Short mmCIF file of all heavy atoms in Angstrom, two decimals:
data_model
loop_
_atom_site.label_atom_id
_atom_site.label_comp_id
_atom_site.label_asym_id
_atom_site.label_seq_id
_atom_site.Cartn_x
_atom_site.Cartn_y
_atom_site.Cartn_z
N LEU A 1 94.68 48.10 59.52
CA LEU A 1 95.47 46.90 59.25
C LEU A 1 96.86 47.22 58.70
O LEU A 1 97.85 46.61 59.10
CB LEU A 1 94.73 45.97 58.28
CG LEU A 1 95.39 44.60 58.01
CD1 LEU A 1 95.20 43.66 59.19
CD2 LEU A 1 94.82 43.98 56.75
N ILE A 2 96.92 48.18 57.77
CA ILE A 2 98.18 48.53 57.10
C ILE A 2 99.12 49.22 58.08
O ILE A 2 100.25 48.77 58.28
CB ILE A 2 97.93 49.41 55.86
CG1 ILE A 2 97.23 48.60 54.77
CG2 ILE A 2 99.24 49.98 55.32
CD1 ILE A 2 96.59 49.43 53.68
N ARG A 3 98.64 50.31 58.68
CA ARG A 3 99.33 50.98 59.78
C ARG A 3 99.87 49.94 60.78
O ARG A 3 101.06 49.93 61.09
CB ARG A 3 98.38 51.95 60.49
CG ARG A 3 99.02 52.82 61.58
CD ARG A 3 99.85 53.95 60.98
NE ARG A 3 100.55 54.72 62.01
CZ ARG A 3 100.06 55.79 62.66
NH1 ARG A 3 98.84 56.25 62.40
NH2 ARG A 3 100.80 56.40 63.57
N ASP A 4 98.98 49.07 61.24
CA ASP A 4 99.30 48.09 62.27
C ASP A 4 100.38 47.08 61.85
O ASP A 4 101.30 46.79 62.62
CB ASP A 4 98.02 47.35 62.68
CG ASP A 4 98.21 46.43 63.87
OD1 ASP A 4 99.27 46.48 64.53
OD2 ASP A 4 97.28 45.63 64.14
N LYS A 5 100.27 46.55 60.64
CA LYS A 5 101.12 45.44 60.19
C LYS A 5 102.40 45.87 59.47
O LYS A 5 103.40 45.15 59.52
CB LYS A 5 100.32 44.49 59.29
CG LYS A 5 99.18 43.75 59.97
CD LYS A 5 99.66 42.66 60.93
CE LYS A 5 99.58 43.11 62.38
NZ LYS A 5 100.08 42.07 63.33
N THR A 6 102.36 47.02 58.79
CA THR A 6 103.52 47.51 58.04
C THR A 6 104.10 48.82 58.59
O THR A 6 105.29 49.08 58.44
CB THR A 6 103.17 47.72 56.55
OG1 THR A 6 102.06 48.61 56.43
CG2 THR A 6 102.84 46.39 55.90
N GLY A 7 103.26 49.64 59.22
CA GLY A 7 103.70 50.94 59.73
C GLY A 7 103.37 52.09 58.80
O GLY A 7 103.45 53.26 59.20
N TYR A 8 103.00 51.78 57.56
CA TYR A 8 102.66 52.80 56.58
C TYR A 8 101.31 53.46 56.89
O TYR A 8 100.36 52.80 57.31
CB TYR A 8 102.65 52.21 55.17
CG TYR A 8 104.01 51.79 54.65
CD1 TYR A 8 104.28 50.45 54.35
CD2 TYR A 8 105.02 52.72 54.44
CE1 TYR A 8 105.52 50.06 53.87
CE2 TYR A 8 106.26 52.34 53.96
CZ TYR A 8 106.50 51.01 53.67
OH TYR A 8 107.74 50.64 53.19
N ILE A 9 101.24 54.77 56.66
CA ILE A 9 100.02 55.55 56.86
C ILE A 9 99.42 55.85 55.49
O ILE A 9 100.06 56.49 54.66
CB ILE A 9 100.33 56.86 57.61
CG1 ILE A 9 100.91 56.56 59.00
CG2 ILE A 9 99.07 57.72 57.75
CD1 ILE A 9 101.79 57.67 59.54
N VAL A 10 98.19 55.40 55.27
CA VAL A 10 97.53 55.56 53.97
C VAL A 10 96.15 56.20 54.09
O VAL A 10 95.47 56.04 55.11
CB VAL A 10 97.39 54.21 53.23
CG1 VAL A 10 98.76 53.56 53.05
CG2 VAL A 10 96.44 53.26 53.96
N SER A 11 95.74 56.92 53.05
CA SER A 11 94.44 57.60 53.03
C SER A 11 93.36 56.70 52.43
O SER A 11 93.59 56.05 51.41
CB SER A 11 94.52 58.90 52.22
OG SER A 11 93.22 59.39 51.94
N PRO A 12 92.16 56.70 53.05
CA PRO A 12 91.05 55.91 52.53
C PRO A 12 90.36 56.54 51.32
O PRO A 12 89.48 55.91 50.74
CB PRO A 12 90.09 55.86 53.71
CG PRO A 12 90.31 57.15 54.41
CD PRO A 12 91.77 57.47 54.24
N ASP A 13 90.74 57.77 50.94
CA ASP A 13 90.11 58.46 49.81
C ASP A 13 90.77 58.17 48.45
O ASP A 13 90.40 58.76 47.44
CB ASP A 13 90.06 59.98 50.08
CG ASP A 13 89.09 60.35 51.19
OD1 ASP A 13 88.32 59.48 51.65
OD2 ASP A 13 89.10 61.53 51.62
N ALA A 14 91.74 57.26 48.44
CA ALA A 14 92.33 56.76 47.20
C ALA A 14 91.58 55.52 46.72
O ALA A 14 90.70 55.00 47.43
CB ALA A 14 93.80 56.44 47.40
N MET A 15 91.91 55.05 45.52
CA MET A 15 91.38 53.79 44.99
C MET A 15 92.11 52.64 45.67
O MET A 15 93.34 52.62 45.67
CB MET A 15 91.58 53.70 43.47
CG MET A 15 91.04 52.43 42.82
SD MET A 15 91.83 51.97 41.26
CE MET A 15 91.20 53.25 40.18
N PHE A 16 91.36 51.70 46.23
CA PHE A 16 91.95 50.52 46.87
C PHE A 16 92.08 49.39 45.86
O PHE A 16 91.12 48.68 45.56
CB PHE A 16 91.18 50.11 48.12
CG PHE A 16 91.63 50.83 49.38
CD1 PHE A 16 92.04 52.16 49.34
CD2 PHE A 16 91.64 50.18 50.61
CE1 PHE A 16 92.46 52.82 50.49
CE2 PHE A 16 92.05 50.83 51.76
CZ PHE A 16 92.46 52.15 51.70
N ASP A 17 93.30 49.27 45.34
CA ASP A 17 93.66 48.37 44.25
C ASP A 17 94.44 47.20 44.83
O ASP A 17 95.56 47.37 45.30
CB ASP A 17 94.51 49.15 43.24
CG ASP A 17 95.19 48.25 42.21
OD1 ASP A 17 95.01 47.02 42.27
OD2 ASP A 17 95.91 48.79 41.35
N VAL A 18 93.85 46.01 44.78
CA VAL A 18 94.39 44.85 45.49
C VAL A 18 94.78 43.72 44.54
O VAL A 18 94.03 43.39 43.63
CB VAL A 18 93.36 44.30 46.49
CG1 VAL A 18 93.98 43.20 47.34
CG2 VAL A 18 92.83 45.43 47.35
N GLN A 19 95.96 43.15 44.75
CA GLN A 19 96.28 41.84 44.20
C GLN A 19 96.66 40.92 45.34
O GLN A 19 97.61 41.19 46.08
CB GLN A 19 97.40 41.90 43.17
CG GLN A 19 97.56 40.58 42.42
CD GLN A 19 98.62 40.61 41.35
OE1 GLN A 19 99.39 41.57 41.25
NE2 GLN A 19 98.68 39.57 40.53
N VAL A 20 95.91 39.83 45.46
CA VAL A 20 95.97 38.99 46.63
C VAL A 20 95.86 37.52 46.20
O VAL A 20 94.77 37.01 45.91
CB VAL A 20 94.90 39.48 47.66
CG1 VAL A 20 93.87 38.43 48.01
CG2 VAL A 20 95.58 40.05 48.90
N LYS A 21 97.03 36.90 46.08
CA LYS A 21 97.15 35.48 45.71
C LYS A 21 98.59 35.03 45.88
O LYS A 21 99.47 35.86 46.12
CB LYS A 21 96.63 35.20 44.27
CG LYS A 21 96.87 36.29 43.23
CD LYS A 21 95.98 36.13 41.99
CE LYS A 21 94.53 36.57 42.21
NZ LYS A 21 93.58 35.43 42.34
N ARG A 22 98.82 33.72 45.76
CA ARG A 22 100.14 33.16 46.04
C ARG A 22 101.19 33.69 45.05
O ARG A 22 100.94 33.84 43.85
CB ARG A 22 100.11 31.62 46.12
CG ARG A 22 100.82 30.84 45.02
CD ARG A 22 101.36 29.53 45.58
NE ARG A 22 102.19 29.77 46.77
CZ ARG A 22 102.43 28.88 47.72
NH1 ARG A 22 101.90 27.66 47.65
NH2 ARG A 22 103.19 29.20 48.75
N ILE A 23 102.36 34.00 45.59
CA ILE A 23 103.42 34.63 44.81
C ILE A 23 104.03 33.61 43.85
O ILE A 23 104.64 32.63 44.27
CB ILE A 23 104.51 35.25 45.71
CG1 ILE A 23 103.90 36.05 46.86
CG2 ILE A 23 105.44 36.13 44.87
CD1 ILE A 23 102.84 37.06 46.46
N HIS A 24 103.84 33.85 42.56
CA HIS A 24 104.30 32.96 41.52
C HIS A 24 104.51 33.77 40.25
O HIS A 24 103.77 34.72 40.00
CB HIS A 24 103.26 31.86 41.25
CG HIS A 24 103.86 30.57 40.79
ND1 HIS A 24 104.50 30.43 39.58
CD2 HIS A 24 103.90 29.35 41.38
CE1 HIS A 24 104.92 29.19 39.44
NE2 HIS A 24 104.57 28.51 40.52
N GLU A 25 105.50 33.39 39.45
CA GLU A 25 105.75 34.08 38.19
C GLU A 25 104.53 34.03 37.26
O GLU A 25 104.28 34.99 36.53
CB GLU A 25 107.00 33.53 37.49
CG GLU A 25 108.30 34.08 38.07
CD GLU A 25 109.54 33.43 37.48
OE1 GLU A 25 109.62 32.18 37.48
OE2 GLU A 25 110.44 34.17 37.04
N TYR A 26 103.76 32.94 37.30
CA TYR A 26 102.64 32.75 36.37
C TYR A 26 101.43 33.59 36.75
O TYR A 26 100.64 33.98 35.89
CB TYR A 26 102.28 31.26 36.22
CG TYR A 26 101.21 30.69 37.15
CD1 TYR A 26 99.86 30.93 36.92
CD2 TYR A 26 101.55 29.86 38.22
CE1 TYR A 26 98.88 30.40 37.74
CE2 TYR A 26 100.58 29.33 39.06
CZ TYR A 26 99.24 29.59 38.81
OH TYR A 26 98.27 29.07 39.62
N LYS A 27 101.28 33.88 38.04
CA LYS A 27 100.21 34.75 38.51
C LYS A 27 100.50 36.21 38.16
O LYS A 27 99.58 37.02 38.04
CB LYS A 27 100.02 34.57 40.02
CG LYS A 27 99.69 33.14 40.42
CD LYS A 27 98.41 33.05 41.21
CE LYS A 27 97.77 31.68 41.08
NZ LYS A 27 96.47 31.61 41.79
N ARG A 28 101.79 36.52 38.02
CA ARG A 28 102.29 37.80 37.51
C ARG A 28 102.02 38.98 38.43
O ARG A 28 101.51 40.02 37.99
CB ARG A 28 101.78 38.08 36.09
CG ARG A 28 102.06 36.95 35.12
CD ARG A 28 101.91 37.37 33.67
NE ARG A 28 100.55 37.80 33.33
CZ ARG A 28 100.13 38.08 32.09
NH1 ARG A 28 100.95 37.98 31.05
NH2 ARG A 28 98.87 38.47 31.90
N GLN A 29 102.39 38.84 39.70
CA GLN A 29 102.52 40.01 40.58
C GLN A 29 103.53 40.97 39.95
O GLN A 29 103.38 42.19 40.06
CB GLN A 29 103.01 39.62 41.98
CG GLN A 29 101.95 38.99 42.87
CD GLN A 29 101.85 37.48 42.72
OE1 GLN A 29 102.77 36.83 42.24
NE2 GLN A 29 100.73 36.93 43.15
N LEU A 30 104.54 40.41 39.31
CA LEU A 30 105.56 41.19 38.62
C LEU A 30 104.95 42.12 37.55
O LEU A 30 105.39 43.26 37.42
CB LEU A 30 106.63 40.27 38.01
CG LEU A 30 107.87 40.91 37.37
CD1 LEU A 30 108.50 41.95 38.26
CD2 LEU A 30 108.88 39.83 37.02
N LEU A 31 103.94 41.65 36.82
CA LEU A 31 103.26 42.51 35.84
C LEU A 31 102.58 43.71 36.51
O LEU A 31 102.60 44.82 35.98
CB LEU A 31 102.21 41.73 35.04
CG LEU A 31 101.30 42.54 34.10
CD1 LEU A 31 102.10 43.27 33.04
CD2 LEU A 31 100.25 41.64 33.45
N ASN A 32 101.97 43.48 37.67
CA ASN A 32 101.29 44.54 38.40
C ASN A 32 102.28 45.57 38.92
O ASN A 32 102.17 46.77 38.63
CB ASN A 32 100.47 43.95 39.55
CG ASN A 32 99.60 44.98 40.25
OD1 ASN A 32 99.41 46.09 39.76
ND2 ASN A 32 99.06 44.60 41.40
N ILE A 33 103.27 45.11 39.69
CA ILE A 33 104.26 46.02 40.26
C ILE A 33 104.97 46.81 39.15
O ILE A 33 105.17 48.01 39.30
CB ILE A 33 105.27 45.29 41.18
CG1 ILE A 33 106.16 46.29 41.93
CG2 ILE A 33 106.13 44.31 40.39
CD1 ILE A 33 105.43 47.15 42.94
N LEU A 34 105.32 46.16 38.05
CA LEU A 34 105.99 46.87 36.95
C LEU A 34 105.09 47.92 36.29
O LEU A 34 105.58 48.92 35.76
CB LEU A 34 106.53 45.90 35.89
CG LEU A 34 107.80 45.11 36.23
CD1 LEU A 34 108.23 44.25 35.05
CD2 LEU A 34 108.93 46.02 36.67
N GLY A 35 103.78 47.69 36.32
CA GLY A 35 102.81 48.68 35.85
C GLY A 35 102.73 49.86 36.81
O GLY A 35 102.69 51.01 36.38
N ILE A 36 102.71 49.56 38.11
CA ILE A 36 102.82 50.60 39.14
C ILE A 36 104.11 51.40 38.94
O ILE A 36 104.09 52.63 38.95
CB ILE A 36 102.76 50.01 40.57
CG1 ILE A 36 101.33 49.56 40.90
CG2 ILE A 36 103.22 51.03 41.61
CD1 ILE A 36 101.23 48.69 42.13
N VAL A 37 105.23 50.70 38.74
CA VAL A 37 106.54 51.34 38.53
C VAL A 37 106.50 52.31 37.34
O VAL A 37 107.12 53.37 37.40
CB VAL A 37 107.66 50.30 38.30
CG1 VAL A 37 108.96 50.98 37.87
CG2 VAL A 37 107.89 49.47 39.56
#
């Protein structure tokens, strides 16, 4: 799916860490990405 939709090549042997919900300041995707950063 990722390869197909984005072009990125990823390994299945990593941890699959997902945040999946509507983009809003209150849901805080920003908190997640900034933690990744």
Side-chain angles (χ1 to χ4, degrees):
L1 185 75
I2 291 164
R3 186 76 184 271
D4 187 11
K5 294 289 101 181
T6 57
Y8 292 117
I9 299 154
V10 303
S11 166
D13 291 351
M15 181 204 289
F16 273 36
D17 168 0
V18 186
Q19 190 178 9
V20 120
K21 35 197 77 255
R22 112 149 307 156
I23 315 309
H24 210 294
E25 281 174 308
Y26 92 78
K27 302 236 155 183
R28 307 196 298 187
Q29 284 88 20
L30 186 49
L31 173 60
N32 187 12
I33 189 66
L34 285 183
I36 288 167
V37 171

